[PDB]
Amino acid sequence: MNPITLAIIYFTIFLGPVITMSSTNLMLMWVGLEFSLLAIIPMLINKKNPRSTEAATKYFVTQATASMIILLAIVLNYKQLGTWMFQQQTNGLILNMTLMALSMKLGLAPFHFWLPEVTQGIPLHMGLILLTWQKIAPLSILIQIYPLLNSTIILMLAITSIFMGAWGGLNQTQMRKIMAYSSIAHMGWMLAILPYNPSLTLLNLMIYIILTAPMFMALMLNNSMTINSISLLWNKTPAMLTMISLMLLSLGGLPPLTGFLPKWIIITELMKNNCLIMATLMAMMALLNLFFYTRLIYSTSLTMFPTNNNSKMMTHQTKTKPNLMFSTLAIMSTMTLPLAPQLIT
Amino acid sequence: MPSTFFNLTMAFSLSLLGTLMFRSHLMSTLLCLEGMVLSLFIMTSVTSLNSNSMSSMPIPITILVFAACEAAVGLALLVKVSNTYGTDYVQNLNLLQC
Amino acid sequence: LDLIWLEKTIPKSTSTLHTNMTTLTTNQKGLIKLYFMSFLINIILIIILYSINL
Amino acid sequence: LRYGLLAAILGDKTTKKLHEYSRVITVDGNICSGKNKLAKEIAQQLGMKHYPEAGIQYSSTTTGDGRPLDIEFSGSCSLEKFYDDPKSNDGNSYRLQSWLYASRLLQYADALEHLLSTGQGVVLERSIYSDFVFLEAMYNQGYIRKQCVDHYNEIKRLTLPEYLPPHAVIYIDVPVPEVQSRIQKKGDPHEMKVTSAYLQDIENAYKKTFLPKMSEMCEVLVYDSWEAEDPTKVVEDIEYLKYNKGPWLKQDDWTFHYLRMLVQDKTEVLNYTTIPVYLPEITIGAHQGSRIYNSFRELPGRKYAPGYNAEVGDKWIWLK
Amino acid sequence: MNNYIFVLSSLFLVGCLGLALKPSPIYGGLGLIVSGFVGCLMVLGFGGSFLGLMVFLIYLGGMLVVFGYTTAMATEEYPETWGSNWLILGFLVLGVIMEVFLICVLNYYDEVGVINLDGLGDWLMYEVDDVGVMLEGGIGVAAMYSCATWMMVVAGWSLFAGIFIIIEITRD
Amino acid sequence: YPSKETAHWKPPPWNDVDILKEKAVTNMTLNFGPQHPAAHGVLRLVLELSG
Amino acid sequence: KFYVREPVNAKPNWLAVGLSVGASVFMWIYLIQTHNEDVLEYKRRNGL
Amino acid sequence: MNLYTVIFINILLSLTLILVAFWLPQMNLYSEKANPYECGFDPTSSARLPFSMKFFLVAITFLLFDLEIALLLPLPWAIQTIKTSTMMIMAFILVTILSLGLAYEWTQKGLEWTE
Amino acid sequence: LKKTTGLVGLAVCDTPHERLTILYTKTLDILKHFPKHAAYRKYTEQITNEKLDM
Ligand SMILES: CCCCCCCCCCCCCCCCCC(=O)OC[C@H](COP(=O)(O)OCCN)OC(=O)CCCCCCCCCCCCCCCCC
Ligand SMILES: Nc1nc2c(ncn2[C@H]2C[C@H](O)[C@@H](COP(=O)(O)OP(=O)(O)OP(=O)(O)O)O2)c(=O)[nH]1
Ligand SMILES: [Mg+2]
């Protein structure tokens, strides 16, 4: 690489969502989305393998099409009302096109097909940057239009994203695809609670981000790609196992881990708004999510898969783990349930 | 003006259908993307000229700048695809399914 | 009962249903032509749902 | 890790610290032909750093106390047992070969780290580019199997192209009867039980594959024994060598920086040697693996990180 | 001379239909050049000429680079124009017939008033300041230099970052 | 969970790189024939060109 | 030396040690002072 | 209307000239006459194969610089503004960052026709 | 001290006495492996010896 273009690209990656979430003009939100996409593409295609090229191409055409639909919605709103924000009396067709295009930006089902494809064939840190940072700007736009959303389309997208994410993560054995389907399921939960409480989708987004940051960090430590690769972790880094298991259980939503809190409070708000059918279906598919997490836990922690001869040399060498980032986020993402009234806002 | 705006919206719809329905050519997909861009530019310019929104007249120039940036990135990715395979075929780039 | 039919009824049948449905869900090829065709079908369904519910 | 992007920005440029003798010189030959002394003398009178041939105990000598560990901590190879009986019921030949490849990979990474960090050239004995000769000799003599060969080739494909080839490859051609006579005169009872077909297999692998495939990317200095057994003509050839081919010419400060990062992180070096391909000659199993790992952690100086071991020193334990 | 803008909009619809129907990218760039010229004429008819000339120049440069790339890599031995498959021509004329059918339906259904046959050409330009200086398009695009400096700086940073982005993508 | 519709798949490579060599660049063959002004009247300079 | 290669941390990084200890002491002092100011302000605003 | 009439008159003039060129002379068409030229030999390829241009990065940079041109072109109306200090600063910044991008590409050998 | 050789592709090649010395000694050492009656050995030894002497 080169430090100058590293600084330019990473600053533009930062600047995109910041402009989107701090700008009150829909045009400036759109140019923030464009900033994020165009800046993150060279970080995706960096290893210059065919898989990286394919992932960059798929991501580019998907996000470009979705952003074009977003800009269509903005221009139609400007035609209808003369302003640059959906105020209160816009067209429901415009709002539904906005929701559909932002769903394809976010990557929730049935627009979810590219997300495991792009997450596969991409290095783990770029998968982390995608699955955490790229989902804040479209969520910021969705939170900005908090009323005047179609709850029917919202709930349909939410339920199909949770269903398809649970099934996909159940099938997959590649770790990056597992993380992508986890992303799809949690985005389904956030979108489900979006029209009733912006605070709860913000809370679920924060819980998901602080939960899947150290999961990706622990994958990044040993460059573990598959279930077998994470299975020979007892020989590589045996101190990782308890935190890995606790974070996987917290992603599953088991009490008393703090990952139970977003699902619990979202179910509470949906009970307050009388959507028991959707809440029950979402909870059962979250149990399916917990099943594929628990199979991962069986592979990596509660059993000891066979190891090979060169792991002796791996034990001979020395390692390095980031301070202030892994352990802090792991503790805050596992043992922060009794601070639930402070976490909800 | 409403007839012309209906025609421009239908032109955007046609270019969106072209973007969604692939025919073996990433370059043709990028062409459909830029057709969508041109339709949006004409819609925004006609709206601003009709409403006399001279303060909002920089909006088409902004969307043109960002659209050319995304077209630039797409052409660079097409160059990388052609270097990888040599044919530039969207069905040929498919190996991330497993 | 306890070694065939309760086992066949609740847990094994639930596992069989969900593994069939996850095979059917994750039976995708990596063709973005097919992915975008599915996205078009999604857009058409959203348009029809809006035009029906209104 | 002291070196990083910040250190490179503040200025630690490899091309700034390069030199006319900042070369990687790899000495190769058959089982017993004068290559340990030749590399020593070449490093001695070129100012390089001599790296002897990476044996079983290379990681043991380069990490920790530096004393060789047990035969179960440092692989399970037993080259003497390989010479005594190949084609054993347990996979010892391929275990020895894969462990030697990983040891040579670690040695090549150490040599590259030394060269990119200090600018001093390095003279290696039989680097990773000349280990497939031993593997192919093992396979063609029937000592290992096609699954082992495929696993080795997969690990070689995963690890080898991420590094740089040697600047110079010196080869010592020597006939198989001469190698046999030198082996018998050495007197090692295990090494005396080597097949002349095996030695001819190593030589054939060398000539057929190693010399052209390295000649297309660096320069080759094939010598005889009489051209060798005189480590001054070789040094004069190295001095008046021309380095006008290979990937050492098309790279710059930032390529050197990323290579230096990848080569100073030793776990990233040895990451692909531990792929979970479950070859029964290589995989171990949970009970033996956990017993060996716990005993290795109970070794002195190995229970914690090397800065933190009160039984061997490390007085300022509570402030770091 | 009243339905001039409607004729232009119909031509733009036809050009976008051809671009959607996806010829060889040589003819795709041709169709986009024609559509860009037609959209320039539409903007010029509706008002200021600067925006139309700008989009014309920009798309001329863009389709030129596109032509170079589809000659370089996005080409084949028999580049289909439109008549390699009769389905493409039949679908083009089917879309034309559907366009005529829909505009006739919307003329017959004159309650909403989106398209009217008798009222076409009557509501093109709504209200204009008859006496007045400096009211044409391009003054606002100049006001991007003084009143929307945020728009100016995000466009400039987009182009700068885009230079860095394309160098790093095609670094190889 | 391999089925009849996905039994032909393979696991991804560990380093996300696989061999996909074609070597089918097909450099353009152009002849400076014996009519070119640059050719000296009588020359068939067959040129393998990369652009 | 027990080790063949010098460990990255054989001596404490005294800059980091002093910075961490000083940051802890400053944060505790600032926390106690702002708690005292908060209880004083609360009592002053609503009586005692 | 005037410019439209002149455009149509020029188009009709060019069409009339090429129609005269096609219907005036005598035609004698056969296969060896209408074969592609290729300097007096049969072409080896089909002249539709990939060409592999060598200035692709320069072409993409041309796209970006053309949009920087589109940004810079409203300057004759921009200099009529009432502020003129923010206008001057903004024009300086725009030209400076365009020049910085060109300088960075030149340093990184982007416009060097990599074969 | 010499700036250029005047022939294209011929490098300047500083300290030429040592290079000529090692080339001539290598030529003599490989001529020692020829038969004593080899006229090529005799004549090439004469040429190399007189050039090394000068
Ligand atoms: C008489 C009383 C009647 C009333 C009570 C009825 C309910 C009783 C309780 C539920 C039944 C028990 C469910 C849990 C046990 C079954 C799951 C199981 O054990 O699956 C194992 C199997 C994987 O086998 P594995 O070990 O990996 O393979 C061999 C080695 N690899 O796993 C698989 O193949 C996939 C397993 C998926 C996970 C199953 C658990 C989650 C179920 C989610 C339910 C969702 C409900 C809504 C569904 C959609 C709407 C219909
Ligand atoms: N099977 C096997 N044996 C190897 C490999 N590398 C080295 N050996 C063995 C060959 C010898 O028995 C022993 C010592 O290697 P050398 O080639 O350095 O022999 P030695 O030091 O006796 O002679 P030298 O003066 O260096 O030529 O190690 C390898 O990759 N596989
Ligand atoms: Mg030796």
- Rounded Cα–Cα distance for residues D258 and D248 (Å): 14
Helix (H, G, I), strand (E, B) or coil at A316: helix
Q: Which residues face F28 on adjacent strands?
A: F49
**Which pair of tokens denotes residue A118?**
């792009």
Q: Give the strand pairing for D168-172 and D24-29.
A: parallel
CA of C11 to the centre of ligand 1 (A): 5
Helix (H, G, I), strand (E, B) or coil at H61: helix
The two most distant CA atoms of chain H are separated, in Å, by 72
In the 8-state DSSP scheme, what is residue A302? I
For residue C17, the ligand 1 atom closest to its alpha carbon is 35
**Which pair of tokens denotes residue A178?**
């597992």
**Which pair of tokens denotes residue D203?**
């030589």
Backbone angles phi, psi at F28, to 5 degrees: -70, 130
The residues, ordered by sequence, that sit 6+ positions from B96 with a Cβ below 8 Å of its Cβ are A51, A54, A55, A58, A117, A118, A120, A121, C30
> Using CA positions, which residue lies closest to atom 32 of ligand 1?
C15
- Rounded Cα–Cα distance for residues B63 and A29 (Å): 12
Mind telling me how many Å the CA of A42 is from chain F's nearest CA? 17
> Using CA positions, which residue lies closest to atom 6 of ligand 1?
C10
The residues, ordered by sequence, that sit 6+ positions from A61 with a Cβ below 8 Å of its Cβ are B19, B26, B29, B33, B74, C32, C36
DSSP structure string for E46-102: HS-HHHHHHHHHHHHHHHHHHHHHHHHTS--SS---S-SSHHHHHHHHHHHHHHHHH
Nearest to F9 among B84, B86, B98 (CB): B98
Tokens 């790189």 label which residue? F17
CB-count burial class (<10 Å; 0-12, 13-18, 19+) for F4? exposed
D36 lines ligand 2 (CB under 6 A): yes
**Which pair of tokens denotes residue E142?**
């100049």
- Rounded Cα–Cα distance for residues H63 and E62 (Å): 6
Mind telling me how many Å the CA of F31 is from chain B's nearest CA? 24
- Contact in structure between A34 and E158 (CB atoms under 8 Å): yes
Domain count, chain C: 1
CB contact under 8 A, F18 and B95: yes
- Rounded Cα–Cα distance for residues B71 and B35 (Å): 11
The residues, ordered by sequence, that sit 6+ positions from D283 with a Cβ below 8 Å of its Cβ are A306, A307, A308
D136 lines ligand 2 (CB under 6 A): no
CA of D187 to the centre of ligand 2 (A): 14
Element (H or E) spanning C50, and its range? Answer: helix C32-53
- Rounded Cα–Cα distance for residues A245 and A259 (Å): 13
In the 8-state DSSP scheme, what is residue I37? T
Type of residue found at E28 = G
* Secondary structure (H, E, C), chain D: CCCCHHHHHHHCCCCCCCCCCCCEEEEEECCCCCHHHHHHHHHHCCCCEEECCCCCCHHHHHCCCCCCCCCCCCCCCCHHHHHHCCCCCCCCHHHHHHHHHHHHHHHHHHHHHHHHHHCCCEEEECCHHHCHHHHHHHHHCCCCCHHHHHHHHHHHHHHHHHCCCCCEEEEECCCHHHHHHHHHHHCCCCCCCCCHHHHHHHHHHHHHHHHHHHHCCCEEEEECCCCCCCCCHHHHHHHCCCCCCCCCCCCCHHHHHHHHHHHHCHHHHCCHHHCCCCCCCCCCCHHHHHHHHHHHHCCCCCCCCCCCCCCCCCCCHHHC
The chains in contact with chain C, meaning 3 or more Cβ pairs closer than 8 Å, are A, B, F
Residues 1-51 of F with CB under 8 A from C: 1, 3, 5-6
The string over E94-107, giving b where at least 16 C-beta atoms fall within 10 Å of a residue's C-beta and e elsewhere, is: ebeeebeeebeebb
Domain count, chain B: 1
Q: Give the strand pairing for F28-32 and D219-223.
A: unpaired
Query: Distance of alpha carbon A207 from its chain centroid, rounded?
Result: 11
Question: Which CATH number do you get for residue B66?
Answer: 1.10.287.3510
CB-count burial class (<10 Å; 0-12, 13-18, 19+) for F7? exposed
- Rounded Cα–Cα distance for residues D16 and D252 (Å): 10
Backbone angles phi, psi at D125, to 5 degrees: -100, 110
What is the extent of the structural domain holding C25? 1-54
Sort out which chain D residues have CB atoms less than 8 A from A315's CB and list them: 293, 296
Type of residue found at B91 = Q
DSSP structure string for F8-51: T--PPPTTS----------PEEEEE-TT-TTTTSS--EEEEE--
Closest CA to D34 of D55, D15, D53: D53
Nearest to F33 among H40, H53, H115 (CB): H40
Strand order in the sheet with D122-125: D49-51, D122-125, D24-29, D168-172, D219-223
Strand intervals (E) in chain A: none
CB contact under 8 A, D233 and I26: yes
Whether chain F has a CB inside 8 Å of the CB on D158: the answer is: yes
D78 lines ligand 2 (CB under 6 A): no
Closest CA to E58 of B7, F5, A232, H73: H73
Domain count, chain A: 1
Ligand 1 neighbours by CB, cut-off 6 Å: A 284, 287-288, 291; C 10-11, 14-15, 18-19
Closest CA to E32 of C36, B71, B73, A62: B71
Query: Distance of alpha carbon B88 from its chain centroid, rounded?
Result: 19
Domain count, chain H: 1
**Which pair of tokens denotes residue E44?**
């010029």
What is the extent of the structural domain holding B48? 2-98
Q: Return the ∠ at Cα E89 (arms to E85 and E91), rounded to 5°.
A: 105
What is the extent of the structural domain holding A57? 2-344
Question: Which CATH number do you get for residue H84?
Answer: 1.20.58.1610
D35 lines ligand 2 (CB under 6 A): yes
For residue A288, the ligand 1 atom closest to its alpha carbon is 41
